[PDB]
Amino acid sequence: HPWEPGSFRVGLIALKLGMMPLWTKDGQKHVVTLLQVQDCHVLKYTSKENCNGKMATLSVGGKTVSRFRKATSILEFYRELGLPPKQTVKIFNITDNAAIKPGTPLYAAHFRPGQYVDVTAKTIGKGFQGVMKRWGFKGQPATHGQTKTHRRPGAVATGDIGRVWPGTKMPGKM
Amino acid sequence: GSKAVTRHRRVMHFQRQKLMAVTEYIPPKPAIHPSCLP
Amino acid sequence: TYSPLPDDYNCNVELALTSDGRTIVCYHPSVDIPYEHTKPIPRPDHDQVLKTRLEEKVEHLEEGPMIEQLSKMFFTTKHRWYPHGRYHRCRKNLNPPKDR
Amino acid sequence: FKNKTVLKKRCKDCYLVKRRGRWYVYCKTHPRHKQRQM
Amino acid sequence: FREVVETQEGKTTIIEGRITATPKESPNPPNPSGQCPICRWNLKHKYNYDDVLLLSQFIRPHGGMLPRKITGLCQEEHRKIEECVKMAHRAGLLPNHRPRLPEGVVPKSKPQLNRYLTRWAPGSVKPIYKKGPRWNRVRMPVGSPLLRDNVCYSRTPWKLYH
Amino acid sequence: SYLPGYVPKTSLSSPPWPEVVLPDPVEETRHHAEVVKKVNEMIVTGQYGRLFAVVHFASRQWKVTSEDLILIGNELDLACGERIRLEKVLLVGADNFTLLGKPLLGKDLVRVEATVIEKTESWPRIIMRFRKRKNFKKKRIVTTPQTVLRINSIEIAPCLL
Amino acid sequence: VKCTKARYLKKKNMRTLWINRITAASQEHGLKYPALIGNLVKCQVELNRKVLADLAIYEPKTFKSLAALASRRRHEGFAAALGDGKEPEGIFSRVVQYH
Amino acid sequence: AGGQWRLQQGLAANPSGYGPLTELPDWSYADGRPAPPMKG
Amino acid sequence: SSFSRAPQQWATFARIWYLLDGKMQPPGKLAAMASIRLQGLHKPVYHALSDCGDHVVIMNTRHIAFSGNKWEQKVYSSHTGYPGGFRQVTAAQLHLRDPVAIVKLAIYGMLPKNLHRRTMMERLHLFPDEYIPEDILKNLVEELPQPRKIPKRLDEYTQEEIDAFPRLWTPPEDYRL
RNA sequence: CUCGAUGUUGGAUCAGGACAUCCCGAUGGUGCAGCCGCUAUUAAAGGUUCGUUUGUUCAACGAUUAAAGUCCUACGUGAUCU
Ligand code: FES
Ligand SMILES: [K+]
Ligand SMILES: [Mg+2]
Ligand SMILES: [Mg+2]
Numbered sequence A: 001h002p003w004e005p006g007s008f009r010v011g012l013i014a015l016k017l018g019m020m021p022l023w024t025k026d027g028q029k030h031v032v033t034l035l036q037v038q039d040c041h042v043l044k045y046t047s048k049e050n051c052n053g054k055m056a057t058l059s060v061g062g063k064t065v066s067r068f069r070k071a072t073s074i075l076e077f078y079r080e081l082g083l084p085p086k087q088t089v090k091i092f093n094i095t096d097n098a099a100i101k102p103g104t105p106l107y108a109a110h111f112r113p114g115q116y117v118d119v120t121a122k123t124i125g126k127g128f129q130g131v132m133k134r135w136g137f138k139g140q141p142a143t144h145g146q147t148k149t150h151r152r153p154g155a156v157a158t159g160d161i162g163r164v165w166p167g168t169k170m171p172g173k174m
Numbered sequence B: 001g002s003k004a005v006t007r008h009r010r011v012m013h014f015q016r017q018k019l020m021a022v023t024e025y026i027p028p029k030p031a032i033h034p035s036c037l038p
Numbered sequence C: 001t002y003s004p005l006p007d008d009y010n011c012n013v014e015l016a017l018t019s020d021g022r023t024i025v026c027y028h029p030s031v032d033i034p035y036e037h038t039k040p041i042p043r044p045d046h047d048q049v050l051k052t053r054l055e056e057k058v059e060h061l062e063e064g065p066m067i068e069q070l071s072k073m074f075f076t077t078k079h080r081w082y083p084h085g086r087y088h089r090c091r092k093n094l095n096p097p098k099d100r
Numbered sequence D: 001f002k003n004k005t006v007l008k009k010r011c012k013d014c015y016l017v018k019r020r021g022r023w024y025v026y027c028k029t030h031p032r033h034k035q036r037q038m
Numbered sequence E: 001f002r003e004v005v006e007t008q009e010g011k012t013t014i015i016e017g018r019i020t021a022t023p024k025e026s027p028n029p030p031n032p033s034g035q036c037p038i039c040r041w042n043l044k045h046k047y048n049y050d051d052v053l054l055l056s057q058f059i060r061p062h063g064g065m066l067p068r069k070i071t072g073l074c075q076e077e078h079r080k081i082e083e084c085v086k087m088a089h090r091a092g093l094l095p096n097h098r099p100r101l102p103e104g105v106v107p108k109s110k111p112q113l114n115r116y117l118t119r120w121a122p123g124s125v126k127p128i129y130k131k132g133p134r135w136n137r138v139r140m141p142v143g144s145p146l147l148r149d150n151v152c153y154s155r156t157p158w159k160l161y162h
Numbered sequence F: 001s002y003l004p005g006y007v008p009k010t011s012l013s014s015p016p017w018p019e020v021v022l023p024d025p026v027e028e029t030r031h032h033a034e035v036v037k038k039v040n041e042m043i044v045t046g047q048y049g050r051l052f053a054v055v056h057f058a059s060r061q062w063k064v065t066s067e068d069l070i071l072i073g074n075e076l077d078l079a080c081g082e083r084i085r086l087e088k089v090l091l092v093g094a095d096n097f098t099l100l101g102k103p104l105l106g107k108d109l110v111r112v113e114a115t116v117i118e119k120t121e122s123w124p125r126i127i128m129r130f131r132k133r134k135n136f137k138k139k140r141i142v143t144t145p146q147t148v149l150r151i152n153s154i155e156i157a158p159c160l161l
Numbered sequence G: 001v002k003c004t005k006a007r008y009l010k011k012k013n014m015r016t017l018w019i020n021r022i023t024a025a026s027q028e029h030g031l032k033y034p035a036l037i038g039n040l041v042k043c044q045v046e047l048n049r050k051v052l053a054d055l056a057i058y059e060p061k062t063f064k065s066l067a068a069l070a071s072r073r074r075h076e077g078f079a080a081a082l083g084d085g086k087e088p089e090g091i092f093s094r095v096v097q098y099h
Numbered sequence H: 001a002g003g004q005w006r007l008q009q010g011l012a013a014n015p016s017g018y019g020p021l022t023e024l025p026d027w028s029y030a031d032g033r034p035a036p037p038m039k040g
Numbered sequence I: 001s002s003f004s005r006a007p008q009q010w011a012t013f014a015r016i017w018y019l020l021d022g023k024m025q026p027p028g029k030l031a032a033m034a035s036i037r038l039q040g041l042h043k044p045v046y047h048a049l050s051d052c053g054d055h056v057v058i059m060n061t062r063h064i065a066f067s068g069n070k071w072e073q074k075v076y077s078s079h080t081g082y083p084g085g086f087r088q089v090t091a092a093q094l095h096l097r098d099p100v101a102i103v104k105l106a107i108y109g110m111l112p113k114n115l116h117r118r119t120m121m122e123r124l125h126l127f128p129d130e131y132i133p134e135d136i137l138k139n140l141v142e143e144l145p146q147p148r149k150i151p152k153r154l155d156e157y158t159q160e161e162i163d164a165f166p167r168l169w170t171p172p173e174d175y176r177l
Numbered sequence J: 001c002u003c004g005a006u007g008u009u010g011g012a013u014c015a016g017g018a019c020a021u022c023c024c025g026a027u028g029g030u031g032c033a034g035c036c037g038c039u040a041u042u043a044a045a046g047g048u049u050c051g052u053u054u055g056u057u058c059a060a061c062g063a064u065u066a067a068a069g070u071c072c073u074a075c076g077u078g079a080u081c082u
């Protein structure tokens, strides 16, 4: 179908290769991130009715992985599709006129220079972290008598409420 | 306790409150409103 | 035509007093459901070469999904379906008294 | 508008109007006469 | 009643008024001694906001109330009907007495909320964000205090505050 | 065509409840006699099965029927096996009719008999009182005499006139 | 101590239970609980609430008759109150006098 | 319930008061002999 | 009844399916009816521990009507638990956000404040419009009368009714009504 | 209430809340031309500086800022510190 105002098309799944600098004709330096599309294929189409949501969805998968390490249910799904299993599968909300047949390959030229995109991924995992690194707390002075209190949260609430509010910033997984 | 004469209106004993409520003026109500008659 | 209550659901109530006025007599025969007010019972519910055999479709479900199924089926909360400990199981009287 | 517990017309051109559930004094001749019920 | 017609013919406007058919009060009122239409028909304390057959006789074609000097109602009854008509409009019981809209005006869609016994105008009331204690509870008025004396067929009196 | 008290129809012109017109007392007196005679013939012809009755006994009321047991909460001064009549019958009912006393039915109308089958005592009832911080504590145990009665028969006679 | 004090609550809760059950049974016939209990007393029917609850469960035809009787007596009361004394007493409104 | 009504007919407010419901004998011997008077 | 013991027990303790039409009805009166049914207080065999509540199906909850100015005045308060999580919305705002919330909350507040309440709520089926699933529709038994009588609009009166009501006053013939 | 103990100022750390608003938003009045102000209505999402002396809270002073708000929270917070 032709593009219409209000139409939403599918996205991609790419691998983050690294970063690189490039300069514009005005002399300004811009660093960029290289994203390589590696074996990206449409996997499933769900109509607006069956989605349980306001829009239809199109499932995309990226990057081939070994079949020896996937669950049986996943392998039989990919067997019927006629494609090797993918590491990651993501769901893209689309309009009815943007549906693509499952099994269609997707390429980097899906996007064009000058376009603006959103990139979603899992951030780097830093494990269990204190408030200073996790939340940017100031901590306590290095000297002038501080007793085993340099990177600690301090007070976590007031005495009146006799409790800690949900959502209070505390040490934890970052 | 509070003295018999106060600057604010002193709270009444509930028995007295009931006494006042039961002894309120009830005006004579005519059978037919006088405005509805010649 | 005066009737204290409608006489179309449970019984035909007729109230009377004895001549002396010391006893109230209540005549209440049952009303039977008319035939017109009934529905008919729904009795109504290949060259296969191979004998049709029973197929077990009772796939084992995990605790969560199973409890969700039971609660929806009987319109209850999930709590009724979770087990109890030995202390409560052994306090329950297994030979309770029975009336008629 | 000045908040007032007692609204008073300050000139012959002041008029009382009830808008948005409260009384207002409006005056086109002297806008300083405008009052809002407090 | 009297109408007025404006006709522009040959770049000239003619203003005229004609006398149309006028309705007459039904004969033999049950209480001829009554001093107003309400007490002449023994209707005092016996009508409510949803009695549109009664209310519609005292309003203008666009929902406006009629003057007391014309209808002959007393101040007490005229005020009762005035409140009853406001509640009837708000309840949607007078769909053929809507305000006049100038040519080219089409109201935009607004959320439909069924309501009845509405004393105040919706737009002029604030939410009760702080209800207050039981001994000083902020109440939501229901109905009108003008109708407090209406005939009560129940043992409980009308609750005007919820 | 309007009476002095005529009121046009409004939501409050008339009461919400419907108007009820009771039967003519003269006509109803005859209809009552027919109902009493019809029920009386059912008793004479034995067109009833199991009967139940409400009897006032030991300050309280008991809905009973043949073969029932009732536990009286006191002694009755009767030897076991003795047959007695329950004389205070408030109600006797059948499948198709019921007779109500005002407040008690005549003794000629209904006869309820019972038999003493056991005279015993209740299980121990603890009575303990306690008030904190007052060294106030006392315990007492009471067993109340009881009598078990079996209802043998409920009989009605055709004495409805 | 709880066992001793529970004897008061047992009697209280039982009567609460009977009133709830009589109320449920009365509503099936379009009567409110005060109308049934109030008018049955006026007919010299001294059935207590315990028996009334048992009748509703196990004698549904007798209970409907009692509801009809109470309803009949209730309508007689209205007719009497509306009258100015001209009408004679209702058939079911007559009280049997004892001495 | 009904306490005020009973008083209007010359009866005790409580049906457990004076009257046949309370004062009449509860039982008698099946043969016919009357029972000893109740202690109450 | 002469039934066998097990069929007798089954019939007496069976669950009935009730239908209620909320169109032009105040949610409180709808809740007062549903509350009694969900608890089983309409049954002479009622007991708290007998789990004898019935099913209540309420349709047209989008068309409920409050009296007075409750649409503007009645506020529903909640708290997410987080600082600044206190939220207060009027009945009008809640109604447009969720067409079953008003009727649901009115019923939830009338049920006994015990561990059975959430089980009773499982037997309540609220639908904003006149669409009811086929399964629920097939098992309905009885429709309950609407608690409020809907007043007729002036355009719904028949000419017989209009003619029956007398004209109460004679307007002047020379008045521009 | 607590002396068979409810640790006592200011600061650090982290702040939750009120609005009687210091700044930012929207309005009425003005002895509001404009630029700046004054006063009132509405608004608590967001923000509300760094230093010299003093243990200080304050205060004075220097340099800034759209603004350097007023309060409550056991004069918030020592089983976190000083
Ligand atoms: S004079 Fe009778 S109601 Fe106005
Ligand atoms: K101390
Ligand atoms: Mg890591
Ligand atoms: Mg540091």
Ligand SMILES: [Mg+2]
Residues within 6 Å of the ligand: A147
């Ligand atoms: Mg140390």
Ligand SMILES: [Mg+2]
Residues within 6 Å of the ligand: A146, A147, A148, A149, A150
């Ligand atoms: Mg250190």
Ligand SMILES: [Mg+2]
Residues within 6 Å of the ligand: B001, B002, B003, B004
């Ligand atoms: Mg003194």
Ligand SMILES: [Mg+2]
Residues within 6 Å of the ligand: none
């Ligand atoms: Mg201690």
Ligand SMILES: [Mg+2]
Residues within 6 Å of the ligand: J015
């Ligand atoms: Mg803060």
Ligand SMILES: [Mg+2]
Residues within 6 Å of the ligand: J019
């Ligand atoms: Mg403010």
Ligand SMILES: [Mg+2]
Residues within 6 Å of the ligand: J044
């Ligand atoms: Mg702030």
Ligand SMILES: [Mg+2]
Residues within 6 Å of the ligand: none
């Ligand atoms: Mg402190």
Ligand SMILES: [Mg+2]
Residues within 6 Å of the ligand: none
């Ligand atoms: Mg320490």
Ligand SMILES: [Mg+2]
Residues within 6 Å of the ligand: none
């Ligand atoms: Mg501490």
Ligand SMILES: [Zn+2]
Residues within 6 Å of the ligand: D010, D011, D012, D013, D014, D026, D027, D029, D030, D033
């Ligand atoms: Zn002025």
